[PDB]
């Protein structure tokens, strides 16, 4: 875990997540996908404490999928993000809290709008045009403040994202082994294979 980024553009939400899994002085894996599809038009990326991350992500995934089957209907990104926030808000006062930070990228089919939500392990939710967790923000936010525009295309968003990854690869102490990039839009979720 470590680097997860998110950018909401005109017609889509783009999530970028680092591929490295490090334990001690060894990079155990360099192709790890730090994300789960919650519904056809909602994607969640995650980072934090080992074990907790995947356990939390899959638990949320199961609950949203259960809801979808029961009602034969897809929950809105706003509704999913609120559910996720409440679960983390419960968790923080538990005996052993989930130490997991997440980004939720979704396309609302009723509103025809992309939506990006940032939620930390305390249950702190915010809707943003662009978001990050951990030390990633300390480089990207200022970069996005400058170059980001609200009417950008998906291709312009991907170039903006390349600029962030390049800055992280230059100034970050750790080797995070690049990123997996996924796009969320009206047609659902797809992965960019060449990044």
Partner 1 sequence: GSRRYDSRTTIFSPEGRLYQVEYALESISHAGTAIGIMASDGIVLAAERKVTSTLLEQDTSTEKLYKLNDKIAVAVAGLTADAEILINTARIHAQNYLKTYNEDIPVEILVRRLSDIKQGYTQHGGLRPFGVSFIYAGYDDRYGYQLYTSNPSGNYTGWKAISVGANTSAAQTLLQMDYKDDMKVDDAIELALKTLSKTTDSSALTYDRLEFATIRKGANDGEVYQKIFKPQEIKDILVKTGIT
Partner 2 sequence: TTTLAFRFQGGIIVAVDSRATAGNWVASQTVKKVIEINPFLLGTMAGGAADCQFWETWLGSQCRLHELREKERISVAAASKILSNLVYQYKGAGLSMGTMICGYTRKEGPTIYYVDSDGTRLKGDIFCVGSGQTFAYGVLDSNYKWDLSVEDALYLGKRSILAAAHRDAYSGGSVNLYHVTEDGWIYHGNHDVGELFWKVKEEEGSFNNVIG
Partner 3 sequence: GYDRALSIFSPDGHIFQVEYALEAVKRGTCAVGVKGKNCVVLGCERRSTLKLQDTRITPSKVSKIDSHVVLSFSGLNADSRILIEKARVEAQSHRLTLEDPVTVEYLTRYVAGVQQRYTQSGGVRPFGVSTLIAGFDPRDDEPKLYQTEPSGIYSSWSAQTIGRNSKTVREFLEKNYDRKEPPATVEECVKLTVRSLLEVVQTGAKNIEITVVKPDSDIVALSSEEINQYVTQIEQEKQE
Interface residue list for partner 2 (CB under 8 A): 21, 23, 25-26, 28-29, 32, 49-52, 54-55, 96
61 near partner 1, judged by CB under 8 A: no
> Of the candidates 28, 62, 122, 126, which one interacts with partner 3 according to CB under 8 A?
62
Task: Please list, in sequence order, all residues whose beta carbon lies within 8 angstroms of the beta carbon of residue 131, skipping any fewer than 6 positions away.
Answer: 5, 6, 103, 116, 117, 118, 137
Strand partners, 166: none
Is the CB of 85 or the CB of 182 nearer to partner 1? 85
Stretch that binds partner 3, among 5-13, 55-63, 100-108, 181-189 (CB under 8 A): 55-63
CB under 5 to 8 A by kind: which of partner 3, partner 2, partner 1, none does 108 bind? none
CB under 5 to 8 A by kind: which of partner 2, partner 3, partner 1, none does 82 bind? partner 1
Is the CB of 51 or the CB of 175 nearer to partner 3? 51
65 near partner 1, judged by CB under 8 A: no
Tell the residue number behind the tokens 């525009």, with chain if given. 149
Stretch that binds partner 3, among 69-77, 98-106, 115-123, 145-153 (CB under 8 A): 69-77
Question: H/E/C letters for each residue in the chain?
Answer: CCCEEEEECCCCEEEEEECCEEECCEEEECCCCCEEEEECCEEEEEEECCCHHHHHHHHHHHHHHHHHHHHCCCCCHHHHHHHHHHHHHHHCCCCCCCCEEEEEEEEECCCCEEEEEEECCCCCEEECCEEEEHHHHHHHHHHHHHHCCCCCCHHHHHHHHHHHHHHHHHHCCCCCCCEEEEEEECCEEEEECCC
> Of the candidates 25, 26, 72, 150, which one interacts with partner 3 according to CB under 8 A?
72
CB under 5 to 8 A by kind: which of partner 3, partner 2, partner 1, none does 66 bind? partner 3
Nearest residue to 2 (alpha-carbon basis) of 115, 127, 137: 137
79 near partner 1, judged by CB under 8 A: yes
Is the CB of 49 or the CB of 127 nearer to partner 2? 49
Which residues here bind partner 1, judged by CB under 8 A?
71, 73, 75-76, 78-79, 82-83, 86, 110
């Amino acid at each position: 875990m470590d680097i997860i980024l998110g950018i909401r553009v005109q017609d889509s939400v783009i999530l970028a997540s680092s591929k490295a899994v490090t334990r001690g002085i060894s990079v155990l894996k360099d192709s790890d996908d730090k994300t789960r599809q919650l519904s056809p038009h909602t994607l969640m990326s995650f980072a934090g404490e080992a074990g907790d991350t995947v356990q939390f992500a899959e638990y949320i995934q199961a609950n949203i999928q259960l809801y979808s089957i029961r009602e034969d209907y897809e929950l809105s990104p706003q509704a999913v993000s609120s559910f996720v926030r409440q679960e983390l808000a419960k968790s923080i006062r538990s005996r052993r809290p989930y130490q997991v930070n997440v980004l939720i990228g979704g396309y609302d089919k009723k509103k025809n709008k992309p939506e990006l939500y940032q939620i930390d392990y305390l249950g702190t939710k915010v809707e943003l045009p662009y978001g990050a967790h951990g030390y990633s923000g300390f480089y990207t936010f200022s970069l996005l403040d400058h170059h980001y525009r609200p009417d950008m295309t998906t291709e312009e968003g991907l170039d903006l994202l390349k600029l962030c990854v390049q800055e992280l690869e230059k100034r970050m102490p750790m080797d995070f082994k690049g990123v997996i990039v996924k796009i969320v839009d009206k047609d659902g979720i797809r992965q960019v294979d060449d990044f």
